[PDB]
Amino acid sequence: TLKVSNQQMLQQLSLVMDNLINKLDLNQVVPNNEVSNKINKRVITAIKINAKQAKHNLEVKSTLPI
Amino acid sequence: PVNKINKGFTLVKMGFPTRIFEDTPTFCSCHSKLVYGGYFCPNCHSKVCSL
Amino acid sequence: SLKHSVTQYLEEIPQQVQNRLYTSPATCLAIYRILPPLAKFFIMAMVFNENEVPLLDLDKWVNSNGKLQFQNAIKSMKSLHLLIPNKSSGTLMINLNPTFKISLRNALTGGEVQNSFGVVVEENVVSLDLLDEYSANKWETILHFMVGTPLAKIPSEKVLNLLKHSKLMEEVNSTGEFKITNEGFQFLLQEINSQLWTLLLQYLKMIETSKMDLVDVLHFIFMLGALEVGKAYKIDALSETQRIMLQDMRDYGLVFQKHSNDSIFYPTKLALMLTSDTIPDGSLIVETNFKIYSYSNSPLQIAVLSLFVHLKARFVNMVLGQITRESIRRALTNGITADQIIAYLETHAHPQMRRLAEEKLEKKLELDPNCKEPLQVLPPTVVDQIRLWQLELDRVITYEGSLYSDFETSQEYNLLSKYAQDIGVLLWKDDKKKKFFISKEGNSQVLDFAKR
Amino acid sequence: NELFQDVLNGDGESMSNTCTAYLKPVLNSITLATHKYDEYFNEYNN
Amino acid sequence: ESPSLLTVIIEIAPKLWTTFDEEGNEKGSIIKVLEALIVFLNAHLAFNSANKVAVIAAYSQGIKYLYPESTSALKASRSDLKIINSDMYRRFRNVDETLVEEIYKLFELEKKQIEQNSQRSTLAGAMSAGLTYVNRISKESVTTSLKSRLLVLTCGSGSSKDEIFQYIPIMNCIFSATKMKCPIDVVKIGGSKESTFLQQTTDATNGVYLHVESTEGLIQYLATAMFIDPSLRPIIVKPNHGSVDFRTSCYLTGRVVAVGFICSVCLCVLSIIPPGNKCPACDSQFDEHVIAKLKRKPVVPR
Numbered sequence A: 001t002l003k004v005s006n007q008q009m010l011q012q013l014s015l016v017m018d019n020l021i022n023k024l025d026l027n028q029v030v031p032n033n034e035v036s037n038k039i040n041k042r043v044i045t046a047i048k049i050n051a052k053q054a055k056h057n058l059e060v061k062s063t064l065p066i
Numbered sequence B: 001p002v003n004k005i006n007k008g009f010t011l012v013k014m015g016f017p018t019r020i021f022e023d024t025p026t027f028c029s030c031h032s033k034l035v036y037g038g039y040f041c042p043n044c045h046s047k048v049c050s051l
Numbered sequence C: 001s002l003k004h005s006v007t008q009y010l011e012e013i014p015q016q017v018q019n020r021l022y023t024s025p026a027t028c029l030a031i032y033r034i035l036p037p038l039a040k041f042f043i044m045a046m047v048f049n050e051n052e053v054p055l056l057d058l059d060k061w062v063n064s065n066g067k068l069q070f071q072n073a074i075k076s077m078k079s080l081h082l083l084i085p086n087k088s089s090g091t092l093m094i095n096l097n098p099t100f101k102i103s104l105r106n107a108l109t110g111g112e113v114q115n116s117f118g119v120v121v122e123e124n125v126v127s128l129d130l131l132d133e134y135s136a137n138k139w140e141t142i143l144h145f146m147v148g149t150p151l152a153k154i155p156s157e158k159v160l161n162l163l164k165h166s167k168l169m170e171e172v173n174s175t176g177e178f179k180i181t182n183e184g185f186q187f188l189l190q191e192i193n194s195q196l197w198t199l200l201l202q203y204l205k206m207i208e209t210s211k212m213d214l215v216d217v218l219h220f221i222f223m224l225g226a227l228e229v230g231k232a233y234k235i236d237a238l239s240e241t242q243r244i245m246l247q248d249m250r251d252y253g254l255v256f257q258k259h260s261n262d263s264i265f266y267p268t269k270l271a272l273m274l275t276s277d278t279i280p281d282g283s284l285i286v287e288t289n290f291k292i293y294s295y296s297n298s299p300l301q302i303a304v305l306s307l308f309v310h311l312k313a314r315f316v317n318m319v320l321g322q323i324t325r326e327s328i329r330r331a332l333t334n335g336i337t338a339d340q341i342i343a344y345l346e347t348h349a350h351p352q353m354r355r356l357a358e359e360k361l362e363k364k365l366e367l368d369p370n371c372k373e374p375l376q377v378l379p380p381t382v383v384d385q386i387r388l389w390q391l392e393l394d395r396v397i398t399y400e401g402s403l404y405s406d407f408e409t410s411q412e413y414n415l416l417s418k419y420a421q422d423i424g425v426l427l428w429k430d431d432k433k434k435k436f437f438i439s440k441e442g443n444s445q446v447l448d449f450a451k452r
Numbered sequence D: 001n002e003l004f005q006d007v008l009n010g011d012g013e014s015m016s017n018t019c020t021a022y023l024k025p026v027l028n029s030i031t032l033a034t035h036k037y038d039e040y041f042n043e044y045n046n
Numbered sequence E: 001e002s003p004s005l006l007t008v009i010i011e012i013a014p015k016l017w018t019t020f021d022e023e024g025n026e027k028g029s030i031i032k033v034l035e036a037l038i039v040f041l042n043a044h045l046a047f048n049s050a051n052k053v054a055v056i057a058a059y060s061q062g063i064k065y066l067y068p069e070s071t072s073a074l075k076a077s078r079s080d081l082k083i084i085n086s087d088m089y090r091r092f093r094n095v096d097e098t099l100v101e102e103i104y105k106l107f108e109l110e111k112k113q114i115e116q117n118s119q120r121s122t123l124a125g126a127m128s129a130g131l132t133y134v135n136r137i138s139k140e141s142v143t144t145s146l147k148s149r150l151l152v153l154t155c156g157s158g159s160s161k162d163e164i165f166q167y168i169p170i171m172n173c174i175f176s177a178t179k180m181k182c183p184i185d186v187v188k189i190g191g192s193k194e195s196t197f198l199q200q201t202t203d204a205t206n207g208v209y210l211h212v213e214s215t216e217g218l219i220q221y222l223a224t225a226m227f228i229d230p231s232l233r234p235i236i237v238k239p240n241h242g243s244v245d246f247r248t249s250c251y252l253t254g255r256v257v258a259v260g261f262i263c264s265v266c267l268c269v270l271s272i273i274p275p276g277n278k279c280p281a282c283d284s285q286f287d288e289h290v291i292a293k294l295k296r297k298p299v300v301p302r
């Protein structure tokens, strides 16, 4: 313009092992109806910015007289 | 493939413009026409049509 | 076509029946695939959030050049009652159908599905040699009966009653034989997926008895659409209405069963073409001397050619046939229009016909590039002769009704003629002859007006 | 600036914003060029 | 309308995910992103009956396809593990079971040789492999008019900085995707807000860039922003905020380049005149006269 140790590496890997073995409940992906509000607000604001930019993108017509 | 005898190895001064975003049409500096988008020149701040 | 037909049929379903239809996840999954891609995208973006969503956000989603597809998607959604619009705080609030949302989320994430996708019992038979063979046997049996070729084996009386009661495949008892209508030959033109869909929609139109539950039948149809060929499914998860319509599908060839009243059933390939689709056989050559050489060995494609082609000889590769005047008249007396015949001749044209037409069009465009001509793949002489025979069948058009004349006063005749013109049943008026004609259905109104 | 004030007292400022936005990049670019000239002038004076 | 191939490039780096878990409050976010990806793939397969799914994992010591399984692995196999419940849709069940079985195999491989640490990230190689797979499926044409779309799931986690060795492979992937009309969508789950190369990938190939910080609620992001089918790309605007400048970094200083000087031979970007009048990446002796012309100060009267 915090490097991780191999011990906690193996601990996290084994945590993913047991969490994949015991149950992969795919129903847990559903948001709790509050973070989804924030996610939708962020996405719609990004869409509003992009669409207001890309609403209007031979020369174009001018409001001026010739 | 160029020849070994060619010794015209020169640095080329050039700029990388930023894609300007504007909903209002503005006059381009290359064709003098109203253009929505463009690229503002990194050296002299004159917008261009294409790259 | 295919998606439009099932979409219109599901449109005709009432709302409280549709909400009951959204209980099974398999039905919701099959219904979801019928929607337009913008509609599918908006549904799947709206499933995973429980909060209600503004319509203006969905409007801002769509680009300015695809707003008409957005309107089509919203109309298809709202008319199918996948959306419950809400008017609170002055905003056109949009909420997804809760039963549909719950069932689709359960279908995707996995969970409670009440065996809407059935249960597999792991005992299987060969698909291509047994299941495909059985499905092709039953399908060729019903099609061979319907096109009118002689058969040692005829299909059962259920499908005969359905075909007699359909808009197509008319029958007269004075001669004692079964006839193809215009829609009968029209049924041959589309590929077998929408053929099966038309038969199933007609069956759905005719299941009005108390022994039939409409929602259970629709669940079973979409459930068979969801299954995979080559694996048996236990019958115990089904209802008794679903069991006997499973028997009727086994009669139709959608599903194979090793024995009647068995605990398992094997869906066929026709079950999986029910959802969506996926030289050729039936490829034909037309010459200017009206000779037909149609590279087909399947008896169905030969039998459908006997409707309008005077067959002369048969090889293993093709049948040598000739488009004669009397063969086309045989097709036209069965209601088959000339356009249907020309469409069939075009859709089965040989690749050599295609390349010769392409060469002719290439030579035509370089000579006169000012005008553009359509790809006349088959010779225009035979097409013009087919249309000429169509016209010579229809040299006269007949309308039965009544003509009123001998009016001493011009004003009464004018008043009766304009009254018949208002009700839209008049076919002729003329003040010089003092005669005006009305249809047979339009006789009653003018007659009660004249009497009163 | 003369053109901007002329359209200002000709069309009453409801339209002169569009005229200013039309010629905004060229005005900014010539302002940048004059600023670079003045900066190098003051550098070579001292 | 037309089916599409969804080739998912997920970068499961155990170091990157461990750093992401340590930065966040929660642990085991690989499970959350994997189950969100599985639900998203189920949604994509529910979009159309004929669409297909490809998943390539970019782990530390190379790449490995997750769905479908290897043909040698299919011929050798089937120990059906019970990670996913067997009562779901069989079309979804086969994909989910294959994906989780290959995840377990790849993680057992990662645990097996976790002592070896590699500094070479293999995201670009996995992107190239996904592009080759897209080419294979498109050229095979068992399904006619099959579209395609690349989804790249990567994590930054604030530990790995921008890697300069990936620049040329990412640009080559950009041009291959633009040639094949295959959009590249990138989801970054990490503390670093901007990833310039992947932003340029999304911008140039008509893709969607989406940087998130929490793995929770990711399926909403995937089903909302990343569910843009290739058939409906022009009629749907993209929420990719943070427009990239399409610049590059200087060779010997590393900063993002302003008006600058490039070598006429090897096209290396230099923000300043290199010392010794020689190209650093190229070893071409520049003429002193032309670089004196470039070093010339502008003119003004006194």
Ligand SMILES: [Zn+2]
Binding pocket: B028, B029, B030, B031, B032, B033, B035, B048, B049, B050
């Ligand atoms: Zn210009």
Ligand SMILES: [Zn+2]
Binding pocket: B041, B042, B043, B044, B045, B046
């Ligand atoms: Zn400039």
Ligand SMILES: [Zn+2]
Binding pocket: E263, E264, E265, E266, E267, E268, E279, E280, E281, E282, E283, E284
């Ligand atoms: Zn160089």
